[PDB]
Amino acid sequence: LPHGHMQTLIFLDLEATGLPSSRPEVTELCLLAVHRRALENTSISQGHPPPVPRPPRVVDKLSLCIAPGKACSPGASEITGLSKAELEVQGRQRFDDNLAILLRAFLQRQPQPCCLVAHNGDRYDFPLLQTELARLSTPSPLDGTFCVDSIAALKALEQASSPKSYSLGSIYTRLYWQAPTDSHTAEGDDLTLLSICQWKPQALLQWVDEHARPFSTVKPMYG
Amino acid sequence: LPHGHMQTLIFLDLEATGLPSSRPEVTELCLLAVHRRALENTSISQGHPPPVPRPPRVVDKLSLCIAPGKACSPGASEITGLSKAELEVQGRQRFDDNLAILLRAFLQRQPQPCCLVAHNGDRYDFPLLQTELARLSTPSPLDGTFCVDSIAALKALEQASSPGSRKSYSLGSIYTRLYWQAPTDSHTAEGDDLTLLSICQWKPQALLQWVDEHARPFSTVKPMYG
DNA sequence: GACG
DNA sequence: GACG
Ligand SMILES: [Ca+2]
Ligand SMILES: [Ca+2]
Ligand SMILES: [Ca+2]
Ligand SMILES: [Ca+2]
């Protein structure tokens, strides 16, 4: 274990103005902080297919809408139900120093070490979040936090279970034979991610501990 | 209007170790911050009964579990699904200065003025939160914030809708009267905060009007205990 | 009452 | 791939 046992997993999901090729900006951020004990206490899914796991009783949640500096791409606005104009009309603030202070205080309430988990996080959420934080004078709140990509995790878990798309929805439906709800809301998709990570909680925690890496090593999506 | 038009309503719900006579401590806190426009964006249904309204798309959320400094009362533990032992196994921190810093930073993201809305808040959540903040070595982040009790609000809205002494204004009683459905996730902070949001979305314009007329400073809320 |  |  490169960094010991992770005591908190923080499921991260972002909405944004678009895809990496577009130099996107964040428009919504959700964190679900779950203690490793809560994950390892998830009851063993029985049946075929198993029911969607119940979220743990104890889950710290932070869900925020964020005004971007540029317009949302048409597809992004359609699927997320957000737009720059409506966010501004409702007085949503930019990704700013106060937000970094907020994140710091929320992270500080979680037992360490702590590991972010995001779906395709290594190619999307982590680099994007690194870019957003790099714009601020405030030192990054994530410099002591770890991260892993849940696509890699589920590939490993599924591989061990049965020696295929790994999109969030494809996995959820494969595991549970249900359709994800509130797709492309940061909280809806974060909850779906939590559910897939609860499919085999012990195995997931084991993989996370083995593959956690410092968020400080994530390269910004763009400069 | 005593304090202008409220730009954000923050629906507040707490779970705690017990009821007032027990000098309770907070074990869970949820804030749902909704811009006044967002409440107004609620689609108007003309069904009878109307369907439970969708929450607005834009709603900032903060939901936190908090370890108390004494055991939960057995009744509170059963009702809430929380216990000091389980909060502690899961590494929850106390209601401390960092929590106030977190609350302060969250409140700053909301367009001002903000008005807290809690069900029986005048007799429970507001005095309890005032008590918890008063223990800290950091300034309360609520001295520039306003508050109202949704029991008074719904009594007023229901009376105006059908010109009340013979009914309950408990959270679930109102919800069922308006929507003919049972509330879900009762006695979780977020679950009941969402139920409260739904009852406040029943008649959004009338609710906002009443809130503007009755908002009072949180700084004037007397602590539950000292 | 109504809040846990 | 898969992320909005
Ligand atoms: Ca995502
Ligand atoms: Ca998403
Ligand atoms: Ca309550
Ligand atoms: Ca409650």
Say which CATH number the domain at A99 has. 3.30.420.10
Provide the chain B residues 49-68 that lie in CB contact (below 8 A) with chain A.
57-65
Closest CA to B133 of B44, B38, B222: B222
Residue B200 lies in a domain: yes
Q: Compute the half-sphere exposure of residue B185: CA atoms within 13 Å on the CB side of its CA.
A: 15
Residue A25 lies in a domain: yes
Q: What is the CA radius of gyration of chain A?
A: 17
Q: Give the residue nearest to nucleotide D3 (CA to C1').
A: A124
- For the CA of A15 and the C1' of D2, the distance in angstroms is 14
Nearest residue of B to residue A38, measured between CA atoms:
B90
Handedness of CA B112, B117, B121, B122 (dihedral sign): positive
Distance B14 CA to ligand 3 centre (A): 6
CA distance A106 to A99: 11
Residue A12, classified by CB atoms within 10 Å of its CB into exposed (0-12), middle (13-18) or buried (19+), is: buried
Closest CA to B153 of B195, B131, B120: B120
Closest CA to B28 of B17, B43, B39, B44: B17
Chain A residues closer than 8 Å to B63 by CB = 59-61
Task: Considering any atom of strand D, list protein residues whose CB lies within 7 Å.
Answer: A 13-20, 24, 27, 73-76, 79-80, 119-120, 123-124, 151, 165-170, 184, 189
Closest CA to A126 of A2, A8, A7, A13: A13
Contact of A194 with A31, CB cutoff 8 Å: no
Ligand nearest to the CA of A124: 1
Q: Does A122 touch chain B (CB under 8 A)?
A: no
Residue A87 lies in a domain: yes
To one decimal, the resolution in angstroms is: 1.8
Q: For residue A44, what are the domain limits? A: 5-218
- Which residue in the block uniquely carries the two structure tokens 């009309």? A89
User: Where are the alpha helices (H) located in B71-203, listed in sequence order?
Assistant: 74-80, 84-89, 97-108, 125-134, 150-161, 171-179, 189-200
B131: number of Cβ within 10 Å: 20
Contact of A100 with A132, CB cutoff 8 Å: no
Contact of B56 with B42, CB cutoff 8 Å: yes
**Number of structural domains chain B divides into:** 1
Alpha-carbon torsion angle B116, B122, B125, B128, nearest 10:
120
Give catalytic status of residue B187 as yes or no.
Answer: yes
Closest CA to B125 of B30, B7, B1: B30
CA distance A155 to A142: 26
| Chain breaks after residues in chain A, where C lies over 2.5 Å from next N | 163
Cα distance between the two ends of chain B: 33
Distance A126 CA to ligand 4 centre (A): 35
Cβ pairs bridging A and B (under 8 Å): 88
Cα A173 to Cα A13, A52, A74, A167, A191: the distances in Å are: 19, 10, 27, 10, 14
Q: Give the residue nearest to nucleotide C4 (CA to C1').
A: B18
**B15 annotated to a ligand binding site:** yes
Residue B226 lies in a domain: no
- For residue B157, give the 3-state DSSP assignment: helix
Contact of B221 with B147, CB cutoff 8 Å: yes
CA distance A221 to A131: 6
Q: Return left, alpha or beta for B23; rule: phi > 0 is left, psi -120 to 50 is alpha, else beta.
A: left
- Nucleotide closest to B78 measured between CA and C1': C4
CA distance B75 to B94: 21
Q: Does B38 touch chain A (CB under 8 A)?
A: yes
Nucleotides of chain D in contact with protein CB (under 7 A) are 1-4
Closest CA to B100 of B135, B58, B144: B135
Residue B162 lies in a domain: yes
- For the CA of A16 and the C1' of D4, the distance in angstroms is 6
Residue A223 lies in a domain: no
Mutate to test the interface with A, among B10, B79, B108, B109 (most CBs of A within 10 A): B109
CA distance B34 to B22: 32
Q: Which of B89, B93, B99 sits opposite A37 (nearest CB)?
A: B89
Distance B105 CA to ligand 3 centre (A): 23
Ligand nearest to the CA of B80: 4
Closest CA to B111 of A83, A92, A27: A92
- Nucleotide closest to A22 measured between CA and C1': D4
Closest CA to B174 of B150, B190, B193, B204: B150
Alpha-carbon torsion angle A118, A121, A122, A128, nearest 10:
-130
Query: What are phi and psi for residue B200, nearest 5 degrees?
Result: -75, -20
Contact of A192 with A145, CB cutoff 8 Å: no
Q: Which helix (H) or strand (E) holds B223?
A: none
Mutate to test the interface with A, among B7, B30, B34, B58 (most CBs of A within 10 A): B58
Handedness of CA A210, A58, A172, A220 (dihedral sign): negative
DSSP state of B144: T
Residue B204 lies in a domain: yes
Q: Which of A35, A91, A102 sits opposite B106 (nearest CB)?
A: A102
Given an 8 Å threshold on Cβ–Cβ distance, is A57 in contact with B108?
no
Six token digits for residue B135: 């223990």
Q: Which of A91, A98, A109 sits opposite B7 (nearest CB)?
A: A91
The distance of B27 to chain A (nearest Cα, Å) reads: 11
Cα B157 to Cα A186, B71, B200, B207: the distances in Å are: 34, 39, 10, 7
Helices B189-200 and B150-161: crossing angle in degrees, nearest 10, is 30
Distance A186 CA to ligand 2 centre (A): 5
Listing DSSP states for chain A in one string gives -TT---SEEEEEEEEESS-GGG---EEEEEEEEEEHHHHHTSPPP-SSSPPPPPPPS--EEEEEE---SSPPPHHHHHHH---HHHHHHTTPPPS-HHHHHHHHHHHHTSPSSEEEEETTTTTTHHHHHHHHHHTSSSPPTTTT-EEEEHHHHHHHHHHHH-----SHHHHHHHHHSS--SSTTSHHHHHHHHHHHHTSSHHHHHHHHHHH-EEGGGPPPS--
